[model samples]
Target: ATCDLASGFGVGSSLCAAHCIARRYRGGYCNSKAVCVCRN
Candidate 1:
């Protein structure tokens, strides 16, 4: 799944497929400081 930690999404939900195209990430908590989730 995806997240806007840089931008929760204190909470979220996502579902991926086994036969995805290239790649897919599910979900992540929005954390600052030590728990920062880098944005791409």
Candidate 2:
């Protein structure tokens, strides 16, 4: 469903954004190196 896809994408985007921000602010000390795990 569109809603499901949107939610999934949103979560992925958020995770990626969080990772980017953490990396930028914390350099190599960012927690969890997983980042985004979306197949899209």
Candidate 3:
């Protein structure tokens, strides 16, 4: 629900950057850089 979360793939980038599989997770918020939150 927030883009303020860090990535969970490489100790960080952006939550979405790690798992943006829209087919499985197309629900959540994004940052100005277009990164999604970990709440996906």
* Candidate maximizing TM-score: 2
Judging by TM-score, tell me the better candidate of 1 and 3: 3
Estimated TM-score for each candidate: 0.21, 0.29, 0.25
Better of 1 and 3 by lDDT: 3
Best by lDDT: 3
| Model 3 spans with C-alpha error above 4 angstroms | 1-26
Candidate 2 lDDT, 1-40, residue by residue in tens: 1112332343222544445456553322212343333231
Residue 16, candidate 3: alpha-carbon lDDT? 61
- Candidates in order have lDDT scores of 0.32, 0.35, 0.48
Clashes of each: 2, 0, 0
Candidate 3 per-residue C-alpha lDDT over 4-23 given as tens digits, one digit per residue, 9 for 90 to 100: 43454323344464466544
Query: Residue 26, candidate 1: how far off, in angstroms?
Result: 1.1
Per-residue lDDT tens digits for candidate 1, residues 8-30, read 34532222122221254333333
lDDT of 1 at 17: 22
Minimum summed lDDT over a 10-residue window in model 1 is located at: 13-22
